[PDB]
């Protein structure tokens, strides 16, 4: 049974559940950030995510375009109380997945579906545990009283947002080989996961809308339950521990027949992710291609850790690992002893993977008010103030409370009848 762990930010460190992290980006460079552990394999970090960026990019930029879509804010997240708070956040929308079973089952798979202990430029026959792309580094505190330093392995760590609050984004860790990007999250491998994440402010939509010609209302707003962002985020991340990360790849095979705000090219990881008829605008020819590639990567995963006999890492046991991988990817074993990739086996796993969790799916699942189609107009974003405040926002519910009738027909995210739930970014 999974469980989410609870704490404060001004706990002190216990080399287990709070430490001092130096995220995989951070390598070698000894910067350490207080961390929680959610649930095992998962990682919260609450500060803000400013990997490759600079000081100013976090401030607006030169009198913006009028397009009231990206908020800036560098002063969020920053004090003490800002990251309790936050942290606070994340342990609720956490323990609200966690309390509806689909939501369960999306975390449980996310758990298991640890990173690869290798990669395609690693030695093919030892397990590497020494790579930013499996592990993190952190102090350990030790009963002689000497603080030390040590690895360790994980799946997914979280941070706040980056310079755009309402950004969400997942990344796998990029290793440099050849003078090259590579992603092992998109070669079968997989890698730590990070995710630049806001739960206060969230998007709005309107479905019941066609062309507001002569128009300037039309109202029918609502804003979205922060629970299903995260699970959005979360199914990117499940995408890339299972190395299938779709890489840049979408162009037009048939944007037209959908009705809500636009057509414009995007990513097919959007499309896969969100679900629904939007997964179909993705072509046959494409998916194809998706298809037959993940299933080579596997093949040759197979391949390797059929010649697995070693391991750098001494606190690694080499079989109960090789089990694990032979489950994660769904391998059988030919007489001979070697894994192989057995073809139904894995397109039901490539399904449950691509098609199994979706946006629209776990709406449905969790009564929850989701848009129409992937594709909809940058909608001025809203922010949610309280949502400690099971007044406001319960871990079973959402906004959603049946105890306030805001249950029905998803009223708790109507813009017109939760007034104070929401506020307009200033
Ligand atoms: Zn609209
Ligand atoms: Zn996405």
């Not at 430029?121 to 499996?134: A, P």
């Not at 949610?384 to 079973?396: A, E, M, Q």
Request: charged letters at 25%; a negative charge; hydrophobic letters at 35%.
């Amino acid at each position: 049974p999974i469980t989410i762990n609870n704490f404060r930010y001004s706990d002190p460190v216990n080399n287990d559940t709070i430490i001092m992290m130096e995220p995989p980006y951070c390598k070698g460079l000894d910067i350490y950030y207080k961390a929680f552990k959610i649930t095992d394999r998962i990682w919260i970090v609450p500060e803000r995510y400013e990997f490759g960026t600079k000081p100013e990019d976090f401030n607006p930029p030169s009198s913006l375009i009028e397009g009231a879509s990206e908020y800036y804010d560098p002063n969020y997240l920053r004090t003490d109380s800002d990251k309790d708070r936050f942290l606070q956040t994340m342990v609720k929308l956490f323990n609200r997945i966690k309390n509806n079973v689909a939501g369960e089952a999306l975390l449980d798979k996310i758990i298991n579906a640890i990173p690869y202990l290798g990669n395609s430029y690693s030695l093919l026959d030892k397990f590497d545990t020494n790579s930013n792309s499996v592990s993190f580094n952190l102090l350990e505190q030790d009963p002689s009283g000497a603080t030390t330093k040590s690895a360790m392995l994980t799946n997914l760590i979280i941070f706040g947002p980056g310079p755009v609050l309402n950004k969400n984004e997942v990344r796998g860790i990029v290793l440099r080989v050849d003078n090259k990007n590579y992603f092992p999250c998109r070669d079968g491998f997989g890698s730590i996961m990070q995710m630049a994440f806001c739960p206060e402010y969230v998007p709005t939509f309107d479905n019941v809308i066609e062309n507001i010609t002569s128009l300037t209302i039309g109202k029918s707003k609502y804003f979205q339950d922060p629970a299903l962002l995260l699970m959005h985020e979360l199914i990117h991340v499940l995408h890339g521990l299972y190395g299938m990360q779709v890489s840049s790849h979408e162009i037009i095979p048939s944007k037209q027949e959908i009705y809500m705000q636009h057509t414009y090219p995007i990513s097919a990881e959007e499309l896969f992710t969100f679900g629904g008829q939007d997964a179909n605008l993705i072509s046959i020819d494409i998916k194809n291609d998706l298809y037959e590639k993940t299933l080579n990567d596997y093949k040759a995963i197979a391949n390797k850790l059929s010649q697995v006999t070693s391991c750098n890492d001494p606190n690694i046991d080499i079989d109960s690992y090789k089990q694990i991988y032979q489950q994660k990817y769904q391998f059988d074993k030919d007489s001979n002893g070697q894994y192989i990739v057995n073809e139904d086996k894995f397109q039901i796993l490539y399904n449950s993977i691509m098609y199994g969790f979706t946006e629209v799916e776990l709406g449905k699942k969790f009564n929850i008010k989701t848009r129409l189609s992937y594709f909809s107009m940058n909608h001025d974003p809203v922010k949610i103030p309280n949502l400690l405040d099971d007044t406001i926002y319960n871990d079973t519910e959402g906004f959603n409370i049946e105890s306030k009738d805001l249950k029905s027909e998803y009223k708790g995210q109507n813009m017109r009848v939760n007034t104070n739930a929401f506020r307009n970014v200033d």
